[PDB]
Amino acid sequence: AQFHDQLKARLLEHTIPTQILRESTLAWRDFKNTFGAPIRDFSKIEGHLAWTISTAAYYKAGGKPWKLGDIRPGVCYLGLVYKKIEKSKNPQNACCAAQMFLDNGDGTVFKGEVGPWYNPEKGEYHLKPKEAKALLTQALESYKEQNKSYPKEVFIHARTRFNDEEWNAFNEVTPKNTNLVGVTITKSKPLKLYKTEGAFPIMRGNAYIVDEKKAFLWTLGFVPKLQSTLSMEVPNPIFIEINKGEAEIQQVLKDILALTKLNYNACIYADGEPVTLRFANKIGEILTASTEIKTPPLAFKYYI
Amino acid sequence: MRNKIFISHATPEDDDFTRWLSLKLIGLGYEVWCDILFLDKGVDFWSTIE
Amino acid sequence: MKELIYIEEPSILFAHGQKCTDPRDGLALFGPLNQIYGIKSGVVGTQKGLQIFKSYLDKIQKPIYNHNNITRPMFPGFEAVFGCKWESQNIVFKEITDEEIRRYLFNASTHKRTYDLVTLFNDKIITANKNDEERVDVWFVIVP
Amino acid sequence: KEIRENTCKFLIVSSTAGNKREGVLKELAVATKVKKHLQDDMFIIPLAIDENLSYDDINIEIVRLNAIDFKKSWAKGLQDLLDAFEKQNVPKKPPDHSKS
Amino acid sequence: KEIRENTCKFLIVSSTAGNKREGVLKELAVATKVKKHLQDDMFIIPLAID
Ligand SMILES: [Mg+2]
């Protein structure tokens, strides 16, 4: 259950990359039918297996497969997701900063922030006012040191709406008059819809606006280049709600759509949710395996 | 006229010795012809070498 | 009447200042941005793991074909796409435990079994990294 | 037009079933005739890809010629093809990936 | 048909212009290939006339 989590968590203190490969992937020949039903199969998909592995290993070597270049310079980005540890007093307090994008003249930064700040409450999530100030200040000095100047515009993602006091505290730690906005992104909300004619689902990239604040987006259709569906059955969309701030809907929607292909762990053409939420989700269980670590690194090579 | 020096060997077992000899001889200056310093395609397999 | 607004696909950057939408064909055409060419690796496991890893490592040099071309772009080869060397003749292997004193007789408190497994693997890796001379880059772990 | 008036080299490909095709053999005979016409440097450069195609059972008319190997890794085949090409003093052109 | 299934011996000749003819050279190349395949050296019997 926690084999990989524990192994990577305890090896994290020595700064060594690693890669775990099950033998069944390598030995998919001899694990054939026990009594007439084959256990296992990659014939139809065999070539793609190589595409799944090589580039990943390349990233662990120190190579950059592909970078995105559709970002306005002099902007921010950040994400967040919580986690349940339920160690002793069933605490709900595990917040893992996801990432941040920066333009240091010519390059792109993908290191993110870390530090599992705690919270006495066990079921209400949110965040106490003290932790949030340091949480945003951290990204602030990171931007200062990687920009040799001050940041201009800031964006924030989330998973759940939040109360007034902590956003007010976030506005309190705002330097000068920079604009801050946070966007809540759910995962599943039922808006099942069909195609009137034919035998194919909706075509990927559609939208359905219900108000100047809320919005919707579809991600599992079928790209004409791929000509085949990304999901076996009819898809399920993502519901978008803007919580606070003055943010135009179309630009933020296209921005969050543009950040669903940076899945370095694989090479599938399209992915459902943006990289940020799942990326913080998959770093959280690494640090929740064992909590004796102090100041873990901020490079995602070792985590992934 | 007669200036070049031919070198023959067995390809699938030893090539490093021949390569080192060719490099050393060309370093000293003597012109060298062997199995690895010919046009990427011959007219035939042999006719060119003979 | 309520209508659906459509959003087009963005574009990603590649080498030589080129652009495309899919990344696979771009890699097959232009390659990565930064050039690093050392994959001196490491591995732990049993000897059958050694031979199977060697076979799979030197197998990927030849191209391997999908069942359906139109949905999966072709894979010509690691050196064909990346311009980086990775072969099955420069591995520095460290031997694994073979006795595996843990058997069906010992199944209570599997947490302890997991602890013993991870302690063994981690100490072996750490000792190999700390004491030996050769410069290793990645560590592959295989186990049934 | 192109085979006679505006061609410099030739890149016949020896696949497994390349001998069966009558069109490739016809254009191969055309290339042989144009080589018998020119007699300047060389025109034909074979290539081999398959592992089943043994080095002796190759197309009968082309047994006289050798072949750069591609059965092991495509990268080295592309490399030695290109440096043989540039050794043959073929006229150059600055690269441009945008056209590709 | 023959050189692969219906050929036993070989009777290459040697004129004063045989070494400059492509057909005979091609045929003897095929003959050497089939002699390697057939693991028998008793295949070609050269002839001298002029
Ligand atoms: Mg992984």
With beta carbons under 8 A apart, name residues in chain D contacting B39.
Answer: 42, 84
Helix or strand or coil: residue C16? Answer: helix
Residue A179 in marked binding region: no
Half-sphere exposure of B29 (CA within 13 A, CB side): 0
The span from the CA of D2 to the CA of D9, in Å, is 11
Measure in Å the smallest separation between the Cα of C79 and chain D Cα atoms. Answer: 6
Rg of chain D (C-alpha set): 15
User: How far away is chain C from the Cα of D41, in angstroms, using its nearest Cα?
Assistant: 31
Nearest to C79 among D75, D97, D100 (CB): D75
A171 known member of a binding site: no
C86 touching D, CB under 8 A? no
Q: How far is the CA of A19 from the centre of ligand 1 (A)?
A: 6
Distance CA A138, CA B13 (A): 63
Residue A234 is classified by DSSP as -
- The angle formed by the CA atoms of residues A41, A42 and A44, to the nearest 5 degrees, is 115
Compute how many other C-beta atoms are within 10 angstroms of the C-beta atom of residue C53.
21
CB A281 within 8 A of CB A103: no
CB interface of C with A, residues 54-113, below 8 Å: 56, 60, 64-68, 70-75, 78, 81-82, 84, 86
Give the single-character DSSP code of C17: G
Which approach determined this entry?
cryo-EM
C83's CB contacts (< 8 A; 6+ apart) are C31, C32, C35, C37, D75
Please answer yes or no on whether A62 and C22 come within 8 Å at the CB atom: no
Name the residue facing A206 among C6, C78, C117 (closest C-beta): C6
Q: Residue A284: which of A166, A117, A75 has the closest Cα?
A: A117
Identify the residue whose tokens are 């391997």. C64
Chain-centre distance for alpha carbon A132 = 20
Selected residue of A6, A29, A66, A223 to mutate for chain C interface (largest C Cβ count, 10 A): A66
Q: Which candidate, C28, C34, C22, C135, places its Cα nearest to that of C79?
A: C28
Distance of alpha carbon A65 from alpha carbon A58, whole angstroms: 8
- Which residues does residue A216 pair with via DSSP β-bridges, in sequence order? A239
Strands A206-207 and C5-6: antiparallel
And the tokens for B43? 């007219």
SS3 B19: helix
C-beta of residue A260 within 8 angstroms of C-beta of residue A275: yes
What are the E-state strand segments in D15-100?
47-48, 68-69
- Nearest-angstrom CA–CA distance, A119 and A91: 8
Q: Which of chain D's residues have a Cβ under 8 Å away from the Cβ of C74?
A: none
* Contacts (Cβ under 8 Å, ≥6 apart) of D37: none
Confirm or reject contact between B44 and chain E (CB < 8 A).
Answer: yes
Alpha helices in A111-210, H assignment, sequence order: 129-147, 164-172
Q: Tell if the CB–CB gap between D44 and B39 is shorter than 8 Å.
A: no
The first and second tokens of residue C11, run together, are 């574009």
Establish whether chain D is in contact with chain C, requiring a minimum of 3 CB pairs below 8 angstroms: yes
A104 is in an annotated binding site: no
Contact assessment for residue C46 and residue C96, using Cβ atoms and an 8 Å cutoff: yes
Instruction: Determine the Cα–Cα distance for residues A171 and A179; give it in Å rounded to an integer.
Output: 9
Collapsing DSSP to helix, strand or coil, A154 comes out as: strand
Helices (H), C30-132: 47-59, 78-81, 110-131
User: Which token pair is A139?
Assistant: 């990204």
Residue pair A286/A200 in contact (Cβ under 8 Å)? The answer is no
Q: Burial of A218 by CB count in 10 Å (0-12 exposed, 13-18 middle, 19+ buried)?
A: buried
The values of phi and psi at residue A46, to 5°, are -50, -50
Q: Which are the residues after which chain B is interrupted (C to N > 2.5 Å)? A: none
Q: Do chains C and E touch (3 or more CB pairs under 8 A)?
A: no
Chains D and B touch (3+ CB pairs under 8 A): yes
Q: How far apart are CA D76 and CA D47, in angstroms?
A: 13
Spatial separation of the C-alpha atoms in residues C139 and C143, rounded to whole Å: 13
Cβ contact C77–D74 (<8 Å): yes
Q: Which of D72, C56, E37, C135 is nearest to A26 (CA)?
A: C56
How is residue A26 written in tokens?
């390598």
Closest CA to A18 of A57, A76, A71, A62: A57
Q: Which residues pair with A20 in a beta bridge?
A: C141
Q: How far apart are the CA of D74 and the nearest CA of chain C, in angstroms?
A: 6
Header resolution in angstroms: 4.2
Longest CA–CA separation in chain A, Å: 72
Q: Report the candidate in A232, A167, A242, A169 with the shortest Cα–Cα distance to residue A210.
A: A242
Check: CB of residue D68 under 8 Å from CB of residue D47: yes
C13, C14, C16, C75: which to substitute to probe chain D, counting the most D Cβ within 10 Å?
A: C16
| CA–CA min distance B2, chain D (Å) | 24
